[PDB]
Protein backbone atom coordinates (compact mmCIF):
# COMPACT_ATOMS: atom_id res chain seq x y z
CA UNK A 1 0.00 0.00 0.00
CA UNK A 2 2.20 2.84 -1.27
CA UNK A 3 2.67 5.76 -3.67
CA UNK A 4 5.66 6.52 -5.90
CA UNK A 5 7.87 9.49 -5.04
CA UNK A 6 10.96 9.88 -7.26
CA UNK A 7 10.03 8.49 -10.67
CA UNK A 8 11.47 7.52 -14.00
CA UNK A 9 9.46 7.79 -17.20
CA UNK A 10 9.54 5.66 -20.39
CA UNK A 11 11.80 2.73 -21.23
CA UNK A 12 11.56 1.78 -24.88
CA UNK A 13 12.89 -1.18 -26.72
CA UNK A 14 12.56 -3.25 -29.88
CA UNK A 15 14.16 -6.33 -31.22
CA UNK A 16 16.11 -6.47 -34.50
CA UNK A 17 17.68 -9.28 -36.64
CA UNK A 18 20.68 -9.98 -34.36
CA UNK A 19 19.72 -8.42 -31.02
CA UNK A 20 17.64 -5.94 -29.08
CA UNK A 21 18.02 -2.29 -28.21
CA UNK A 22 16.65 -0.56 -25.15
CA UNK A 23 16.75 3.05 -24.04
CA UNK A 24 15.59 5.24 -21.20
CA UNK A 25 16.28 8.84 -20.28
CA UNK A 26 18.28 9.86 -17.27
CA UNK A 27 15.71 11.67 -15.18
CA UNK A 28 14.29 11.10 -11.73
CA UNK A 29 11.28 13.35 -11.24
CA UNK A 30 9.70 14.37 -7.95
CA UNK A 31 6.19 15.14 -9.18
CA UNK A 32 6.56 17.99 -11.69
CA UNK A 33 10.04 18.99 -10.48
CA UNK A 34 12.63 17.42 -12.81
CA UNK A 35 14.81 16.82 -9.75
CA UNK A 36 17.66 14.46 -10.59
CA UNK A 37 19.37 14.57 -13.98
CA UNK A 38 21.96 11.82 -13.63
CA UNK A 39 19.92 8.70 -13.01
CA UNK A 40 20.77 5.60 -14.92
CA UNK A 41 17.70 3.49 -15.48
CA UNK A 42 19.27 0.86 -17.70
CA UNK A 43 20.84 -1.97 -15.70
CA UNK A 44 23.22 -4.39 -17.42
CA UNK A 45 23.33 -7.85 -15.92
CA UNK A 46 26.49 -9.61 -16.98
CA UNK A 47 27.25 -9.30 -20.63
CA UNK A 48 23.95 -10.40 -22.16
CA UNK A 49 21.08 -8.56 -20.46
CA UNK A 50 19.92 -5.03 -19.76
CA UNK A 51 16.95 -4.37 -17.53
CA UNK A 52 15.25 -1.07 -18.11
CA UNK A 53 13.16 0.26 -15.26
CA UNK A 54 10.51 3.02 -15.00
CA UNK A 55 8.49 3.97 -12.00
CA UNK A 56 9.60 4.51 -8.43
CA UNK A 57 13.35 5.09 -8.11
CA UNK A 58 13.79 3.87 -4.55
CA UNK A 59 12.23 0.61 -5.76
CA UNK A 60 14.46 0.58 -8.86
CA UNK A 61 17.45 0.96 -6.58
CA UNK A 62 16.12 -2.08 -4.68
CA UNK A 63 15.80 -4.09 -7.89
CA UNK A 64 19.39 -3.10 -8.72
CA UNK A 65 20.65 -4.53 -5.42
CA UNK A 66 18.68 -7.69 -6.08
CA UNK A 67 20.25 -8.13 -9.50
CA UNK A 68 23.77 -7.68 -8.23
CA UNK A 69 22.97 -10.34 -5.62
CA UNK A 70 21.71 -12.81 -8.18
CA UNK A 71 25.08 -12.48 -9.94
CA UNK A 72 27.09 -12.98 -6.73
CA UNK A 73 25.00 -15.96 -5.67
CA UNK A 74 25.14 -17.63 -9.11
CA UNK A 75 28.94 -17.56 -9.07
CA UNK A 76 28.90 -19.53 -5.81
CA UNK A 77 30.10 -23.11 -6.24
CA UNK A 78 29.66 -22.55 -9.96
CA UNK A 79 32.83 -23.38 -11.90
CA UNK A 80 30.92 -22.36 -15.06
CA UNK A 81 29.70 -18.95 -13.82
CA UNK A 82 31.38 -17.06 -16.68
CA UNK A 83 30.30 -19.68 -19.24
CA UNK A 84 27.61 -22.40 -19.58
CA UNK A 85 25.92 -21.56 -16.28
CA UNK A 86 25.86 -17.81 -16.51
CA UNK A 87 22.66 -15.85 -16.01
CA UNK A 88 20.41 -15.80 -19.06
CA UNK A 89 17.92 -13.00 -19.82
CA UNK A 90 15.10 -15.55 -19.30
CA UNK A 91 16.36 -16.36 -15.82
CA UNK A 92 16.64 -12.72 -14.78
CA UNK A 93 13.21 -12.03 -16.18
CA UNK A 94 11.40 -14.93 -14.59
CA UNK A 95 13.02 -14.04 -11.28
CA UNK A 96 11.86 -10.44 -11.45
CA UNK A 97 8.40 -11.36 -12.69
CA UNK A 98 8.17 -13.69 -9.72
CA UNK A 99 9.12 -10.97 -7.25
CA UNK A 100 6.79 -8.42 -8.80
CA UNK A 101 3.75 -10.70 -8.62
CA UNK A 102 4.55 -11.81 -5.08
CA UNK A 103 4.86 -8.21 -3.97
CA UNK A 104 1.53 -7.28 -5.55
CA UNK A 105 -0.13 -10.25 -3.92
CA UNK A 106 1.02 -8.97 -0.52
CA UNK A 107 -0.46 -5.57 -1.35
CA UNK A 108 2.97 -3.92 -1.24
CA UNK A 109 4.14 -3.60 -4.85
CA UNK A 110 7.42 -2.45 -6.26
CA UNK A 111 5.97 0.50 -8.13
CA UNK A 112 7.69 -0.19 -11.44
CA UNK A 113 7.34 -1.20 -15.05
CA UNK A 114 10.36 -3.19 -16.23
CA UNK A 115 11.60 -4.40 -19.59
CA UNK A 116 14.24 -7.09 -19.73
CA UNK A 117 16.10 -7.03 -23.01
CA UNK A 118 18.73 -9.54 -23.89
CA UNK A 119 20.10 -12.37 -26.00
CA UNK A 120 19.90 -16.00 -25.00
CA UNK A 121 22.96 -18.30 -25.26
CA UNK A 122 21.64 -19.89 -28.45
CA UNK A 123 21.25 -16.49 -30.10
CA UNK A 124 17.52 -15.86 -29.53
CA UNK A 125 16.52 -12.31 -28.78
CA UNK A 126 14.66 -11.84 -25.51
CA UNK A 127 12.35 -8.94 -24.83
CA UNK A 128 9.73 -9.12 -22.13
CA UNK A 129 7.82 -6.73 -19.88
CA UNK A 130 6.70 -7.03 -16.25
CA UNK A 131 5.07 -4.35 -14.07
CA UNK A 132 3.87 -3.61 -10.55
CA UNK A 133 0.97 -6.03 -10.96
CA UNK A 134 2.98 -9.03 -12.20
CA UNK A 135 1.56 -8.66 -15.68
CA UNK A 136 3.96 -9.83 -18.36
CA UNK A 137 4.01 -9.76 -22.16
CA UNK A 138 6.34 -9.94 -25.08
CA UNK A 139 6.26 -8.16 -28.46
CA UNK A 140 8.73 -7.09 -31.18
CA UNK A 141 8.61 -3.65 -29.52
CA UNK A 142 7.90 -2.85 -25.89
CA UNK A 143 7.68 0.46 -24.17
CA UNK A 144 6.46 1.55 -20.77
CA UNK A 145 4.37 4.47 -19.58
CA UNK A 146 4.22 7.34 -21.98
CA UNK A 147 6.36 5.51 -24.52
CA UNK A 148 3.73 2.87 -24.92
CA UNK A 149 1.52 5.56 -26.41
CA UNK A 150 4.02 7.40 -28.63
CA UNK A 151 7.05 5.13 -29.11
CA UNK A 152 5.30 1.88 -29.95
CA UNK A 153 3.42 3.37 -32.91
CA UNK A 154 6.73 4.52 -34.33
CA UNK A 155 8.81 1.42 -33.59
CA UNK A 156 5.96 -0.69 -34.98
CA UNK A 157 6.20 0.97 -38.40
CA UNK A 158 9.64 -0.63 -38.54
CA UNK A 159 8.75 -4.01 -37.03
CA UNK A 160 5.00 -4.56 -37.35
CA UNK A 161 5.15 -8.36 -36.98
CA UNK A 162 7.56 -11.24 -36.22
CA UNK A 163 8.60 -11.65 -39.87
CA UNK A 164 9.86 -8.04 -39.87
CA UNK A 165 12.56 -8.77 -37.30
CA UNK A 166 14.98 -10.57 -39.65
CA UNK A 167 14.68 -7.65 -42.12
CA UNK A 168 15.76 -5.01 -39.60
CA UNK A 169 19.38 -3.93 -39.03
CA UNK A 170 20.97 -2.34 -35.96
CA UNK A 171 21.39 0.84 -37.92
CA UNK A 172 17.66 1.04 -38.70
CA UNK A 173 16.65 -0.02 -35.20
CA UNK A 174 18.94 2.45 -33.48
CA UNK A 175 17.67 5.22 -35.76
CA UNK A 176 14.05 4.48 -34.83
CA UNK A 177 14.85 4.25 -31.12
CA UNK A 178 16.68 7.55 -31.27
CA UNK A 179 13.78 9.26 -33.07
CA UNK A 180 11.21 7.90 -30.57
CA UNK A 181 13.33 9.29 -27.78
CA UNK A 182 13.13 12.68 -29.51
CA UNK A 183 9.38 12.52 -29.90
CA UNK A 184 9.12 11.71 -26.20
CA UNK A 185 11.22 14.76 -25.28
CA UNK A 186 8.82 16.77 -27.40
CA UNK A 187 5.58 15.53 -25.92
CA UNK A 188 6.26 13.98 -22.47
CA UNK A 189 6.44 16.69 -19.80
CA UNK A 190 8.43 14.32 -17.59
CA UNK A 191 11.23 13.56 -20.03
CA UNK A 192 14.81 14.62 -20.11
CA UNK A 193 16.93 15.37 -23.10
CA UNK A 194 19.73 13.16 -21.80
CA UNK A 195 19.39 9.40 -22.23
CA UNK A 196 21.07 6.01 -22.33
CA UNK A 197 20.79 3.33 -24.96
CA UNK A 198 22.00 -0.24 -24.94
CA UNK A 199 22.32 -2.76 -27.74
CA UNK A 200 22.68 -6.47 -27.04
CA UNK A 201 23.90 -8.20 -30.20
CA UNK A 202 24.63 -11.93 -30.68
CA UNK A 203 27.99 -11.14 -32.31
CA UNK A 204 29.23 -7.82 -31.01
CA UNK A 205 27.80 -8.39 -27.53
CA UNK A 206 26.79 -5.57 -25.21
CA UNK A 207 27.39 -2.02 -26.36
CA UNK A 208 26.18 0.46 -23.75
CA UNK A 209 25.95 4.10 -24.82
CA UNK A 210 25.85 6.67 -22.06
CA UNK A 211 25.35 10.44 -22.23
CA UNK A 212 23.35 10.59 -25.46
CA UNK A 213 21.41 13.78 -26.22
CA UNK A 214 18.40 14.30 -28.42
CA UNK A 215 19.70 16.31 -31.42
CA UNK A 216 18.30 17.49 -34.80
CA UNK A 217 15.18 19.07 -33.28
CA UNK A 218 12.65 21.15 -35.18
CA UNK A 219 11.61 24.28 -33.28
CA UNK A 220 12.11 26.94 -35.92
CA UNK A 221 8.44 26.94 -37.03
CA UNK A 222 7.53 28.39 -33.63
CA UNK A 223 8.64 31.82 -34.84
CA UNK A 224 5.57 32.09 -37.04
CA UNK A 225 3.03 31.21 -34.32
CA UNK A 226 1.42 34.12 -32.58
CA UNK A 227 -1.64 34.33 -30.38
CA UNK A 228 -4.16 31.55 -30.19
CA UNK A 229 -6.51 32.47 -32.98
CA UNK A 230 -6.93 36.06 -34.07
CA UNK A 231 -3.83 37.84 -32.85
CA UNK A 232 -1.85 39.02 -35.87
CA UNK A 233 1.35 40.22 -34.25
Amino acid sequence: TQQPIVTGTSVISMKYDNGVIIAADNLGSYGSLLRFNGVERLIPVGDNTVVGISGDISDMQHIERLLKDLVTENAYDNPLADAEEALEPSYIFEYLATVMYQRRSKMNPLWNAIIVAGVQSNGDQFLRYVNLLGVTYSSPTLATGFGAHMANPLLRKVVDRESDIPKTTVQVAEEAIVNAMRVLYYRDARSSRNFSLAIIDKNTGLTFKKNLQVENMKWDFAKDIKGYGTQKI
Binding site: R65, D69, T72, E73, A75, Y76, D77, P79
Partner: protein, 122 residues
Protein backbone atom coordinates in the same frame (compact mmCIF):
# COMPACT_ATOMS: atom_id res chain seq x y z
CA UNK B 1 35.41 -39.39 38.10
CA UNK B 2 35.34 -39.41 34.26
CA UNK B 3 32.91 -38.70 31.38
CA UNK B 4 33.99 -35.09 30.81
CA UNK B 5 34.40 -35.87 27.12
CA UNK B 6 30.96 -37.15 26.14
CA UNK B 7 29.18 -33.77 25.96
CA UNK B 8 30.29 -30.69 24.14
CA UNK B 9 30.28 -27.58 26.35
CA UNK B 10 31.66 -29.43 29.43
CA UNK B 11 34.87 -28.15 31.04
CA UNK B 12 37.24 -30.95 32.14
CA UNK B 13 39.17 -30.58 35.44
CA UNK B 14 42.00 -28.99 33.51
CA UNK B 15 39.81 -26.49 31.65
CA UNK B 16 39.73 -28.20 28.27
CA UNK B 17 36.68 -28.87 26.11
CA UNK B 18 37.36 -32.41 24.95
CA UNK B 19 34.74 -32.48 22.20
CA UNK B 20 36.45 -29.55 20.46
CA UNK B 21 39.79 -31.35 20.74
CA UNK B 22 38.36 -34.47 19.16
CA UNK B 23 37.07 -32.27 16.34
CA UNK B 24 40.65 -31.19 15.75
CA UNK B 25 41.55 -34.87 15.30
CA UNK B 26 39.04 -35.10 12.42
CA UNK B 27 40.86 -32.12 10.91
CA UNK B 28 44.30 -33.82 11.24
CA UNK B 29 42.99 -36.83 9.31
CA UNK B 30 42.21 -34.65 6.33
CA UNK B 31 43.83 -33.33 3.17
CA UNK B 32 46.30 -30.49 3.50
CA UNK B 33 45.38 -27.04 2.39
CA UNK B 34 47.33 -23.85 2.78
CA UNK B 35 47.29 -20.17 2.35
CA UNK B 36 50.06 -17.77 1.51
CA UNK B 37 49.65 -14.04 1.90
CA UNK B 38 51.52 -11.96 -0.66
CA UNK B 39 52.51 -8.30 -1.30
CA UNK B 40 49.00 -7.46 -2.45
CA UNK B 41 46.88 -10.63 -2.23
CA UNK B 42 46.49 -14.19 -0.95
CA UNK B 43 46.78 -17.61 -2.54
CA UNK B 44 44.95 -20.75 -1.51
CA UNK B 45 45.87 -24.23 -2.46
CA UNK B 46 44.55 -27.60 -1.47
CA UNK B 47 45.45 -31.23 -2.13
CA UNK B 48 42.50 -33.19 -3.50
CA UNK B 49 42.80 -36.96 -3.13
CA UNK B 50 42.04 -39.18 -6.12
CA UNK B 51 40.11 -42.03 -4.48
CA UNK B 52 39.95 -43.76 -7.91
CA UNK B 53 40.18 -43.11 -11.68
CA UNK B 54 36.39 -42.76 -11.86
CA UNK B 55 36.54 -39.22 -10.47
CA UNK B 56 35.96 -36.75 -13.28
CA UNK B 57 39.17 -34.67 -13.27
CA UNK B 58 38.94 -31.04 -12.11
CA UNK B 59 35.20 -31.22 -11.24
CA UNK B 60 34.96 -31.71 -7.46
CA UNK B 61 36.05 -28.18 -6.68
CA UNK B 62 36.86 -27.71 -3.02
CA UNK B 63 37.95 -24.09 -2.67
CA UNK B 64 34.95 -21.76 -2.27
CA UNK B 65 34.34 -18.05 -2.77
CA UNK B 66 32.43 -15.79 -0.41
CA UNK B 67 30.92 -12.61 -1.90
CA UNK B 68 33.31 -11.83 -4.72
CA UNK B 69 36.55 -11.13 -2.82
CA UNK B 70 37.01 -13.95 -0.28
CA UNK B 71 38.38 -17.42 -0.77
CA UNK B 72 37.87 -20.24 1.69
CA UNK B 73 39.49 -23.65 1.86
CA UNK B 74 39.43 -26.13 4.68
CA UNK B 75 40.59 -29.52 5.81
CA UNK B 76 38.58 -32.12 7.66
CA UNK B 77 34.92 -33.03 7.22
CA UNK B 78 34.17 -31.38 3.94
CA UNK B 79 30.46 -30.98 4.65
CA UNK B 80 31.14 -29.05 7.88
CA UNK B 81 33.28 -26.71 5.85
CA UNK B 82 30.46 -26.18 3.36
CA UNK B 83 28.11 -25.47 6.25
CA UNK B 84 30.57 -22.94 7.54
CA UNK B 85 30.82 -21.26 4.10
CA UNK B 86 27.02 -21.13 3.73
CA UNK B 87 26.89 -19.12 6.93
CA UNK B 88 29.79 -16.94 5.84
CA UNK B 89 27.84 -16.13 2.72
CA UNK B 90 24.71 -15.15 4.68
CA UNK B 91 26.94 -13.14 6.96
CA UNK B 92 28.74 -11.35 4.11
CA UNK B 93 25.44 -10.56 2.33
CA UNK B 94 23.92 -9.18 5.53
CA UNK B 95 26.89 -6.85 5.90
CA UNK B 96 26.74 -5.60 2.31
CA UNK B 97 22.95 -5.03 2.45
CA UNK B 98 23.19 -2.79 5.49
CA UNK B 99 26.56 -1.10 4.85
CA UNK B 100 26.90 -1.19 0.99
CA UNK B 101 30.63 -2.00 1.02
CA UNK B 102 31.69 -5.66 0.69
CA UNK B 103 32.71 -7.31 3.96
CA UNK B 104 36.19 -6.47 5.30
CA UNK B 105 38.32 -9.53 5.88
CA UNK B 106 38.88 -8.95 9.59
CA UNK B 107 35.12 -8.52 10.06
CA UNK B 108 34.42 -11.66 8.06
CA UNK B 109 36.88 -13.60 10.16
CA UNK B 110 35.15 -12.68 13.38
CA UNK B 111 31.76 -13.52 11.87
CA UNK B 112 33.08 -17.02 11.25
CA UNK B 113 34.84 -17.09 14.61
CA UNK B 114 31.72 -16.22 16.57
CA UNK B 115 29.61 -18.82 14.80
CA UNK B 116 32.20 -21.55 15.32
CA UNK B 117 32.69 -20.58 18.96
CA UNK B 118 28.94 -20.68 19.35
CA UNK B 119 29.11 -24.36 18.59
CA UNK B 120 31.28 -24.94 21.67
CA UNK B 121 28.76 -23.44 24.09
CA UNK B 122 26.08 -26.14 24.21
Amino acid sequence: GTGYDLSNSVFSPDGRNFQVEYAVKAVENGTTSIGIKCNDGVVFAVEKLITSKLLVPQKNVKIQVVDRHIGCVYSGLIPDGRHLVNRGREEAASFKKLYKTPIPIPAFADRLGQYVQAHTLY
